[PDB]
Amino acid sequence: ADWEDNMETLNDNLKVIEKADNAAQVKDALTKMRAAALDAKKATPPKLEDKSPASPEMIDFRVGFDILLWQIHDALCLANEGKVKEAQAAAEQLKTTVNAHWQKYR
Amino acid sequence: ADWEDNMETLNDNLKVIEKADNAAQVKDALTKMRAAALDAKKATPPKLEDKSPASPEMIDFRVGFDILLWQIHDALCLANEGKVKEAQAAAEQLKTTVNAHWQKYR
Amino acid sequence: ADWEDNMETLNDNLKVIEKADNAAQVKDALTKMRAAALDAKKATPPKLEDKSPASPEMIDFRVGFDILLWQIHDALCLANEGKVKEAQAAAEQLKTTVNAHWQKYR
Ligand SMILES: [Bi+3]
Ligand SMILES: [Cl-]
Ligand SMILES: [Cl-]
Ligand SMILES: [Cl-]
Ligand SMILES: [Cl-]
Ligand SMILES: [Cl-]
Ligand code: NA
Ligand SMILES: [Zn+2]
Ligand SMILES: [Zn+2]
């Protein structure tokens, strides 16, 4: 998927986590978030289309998804251990990071 | 190691996991897979030898090994909790990913 | 912060771990190490400042930080399992990896 569609998937699944009732739903949403963050590493935001693919700006873009992926990892471990409330709080932090990346590159 | 030798290491350790008897053996195999996948990220596979290292095709190749690394981690989290059969079930997804990568890039 | 400041942050938190008494302290220092390693991954280290951003040397630099991030992850797992002494021994190995990277790219 292109970058904005992958960001939409991240946001849709943050809402699923915020409203979730059990650990299985949280786990499923986090797995979708991970797949979207990895796919977005292959994307180029429109404002960077005129940059080299390994320009410092595009490295910052890709490593920003690495930052999200490690936070997704913390939340997904918490969900897998049944720590649903901790996973949801972690998702609130994920929301902050996703928004910051959106604002930086759109 | 070059790409093909890393791919051999990935398949050899998938076979170890399939037959493994305890969590320590699964953890050991998965750690070797992780090391081989990180090493292959620095390689150029046969199909991409006509592409530059920072080409979009090579970025997509490296992100494909990032995808494999997070799948390896799903099995590793299960093994660290001692859920050996569940970790082995997770390793089946690893098999699909490794085989697809082999066919795509050899 | 620049790359060298992140390498300093990695060493400050290694010292925090070496003197730690409980798992939460070790976990906190390792989380700070993860953040610093991720910030450093997007930098250009002093030794490679004369290389093109699309150089293979810069890809090997970035993949070296992925290797470090997975070593940090393993120590963090040990701390999350409450294995403080094992986590500290793993962090002693981390000190080697971090300082070796520092000396390689400064
Ligand atoms: Bi773990
Ligand atoms: Cl790159
Ligand atoms: Cl990158
Ligand atoms: Cl974990
Ligand atoms: Cl990449
Ligand atoms: Cl890279
Ligand atoms: Na071979
Ligand atoms: Zn890269
Ligand atoms: Zn983990």
From Swiss-Prot, chains A, B, C:
Comp. bias (Basic and acidic residues): 47-60
Taxonomic superkingdom: Bacteria
Compartments where found: Periplasm
Cofactor(s) this protein requires: heme b
Residue positions binding heme b: M7, W102
Cofactor binding, note field: Binds 1 heme b (iron(II)-protoporphyrin IX) group per molecule.
GO biological process: electron transport chain
Gene Ontology cellular-component terms listed: periplasmic space
Keyword match Iron: yes
Keywords, comma-separated and alphabetical: Electron transport, Heme, Iron, Metal-binding, Periplasm, Signal, Transport
GO MF annotation, one: iron ion binding
Tagged with keyword Electron transport: yes
Family per similarity comment: Belongs to the cytochrome b562 family.
Description of how the protein assembles with itself and partners: Monomer.
Function field: Electron-transport protein of unknown function.
Stated name of the protein: Soluble cytochrome b562
Encoding gene, per UniProt annotation: cybC
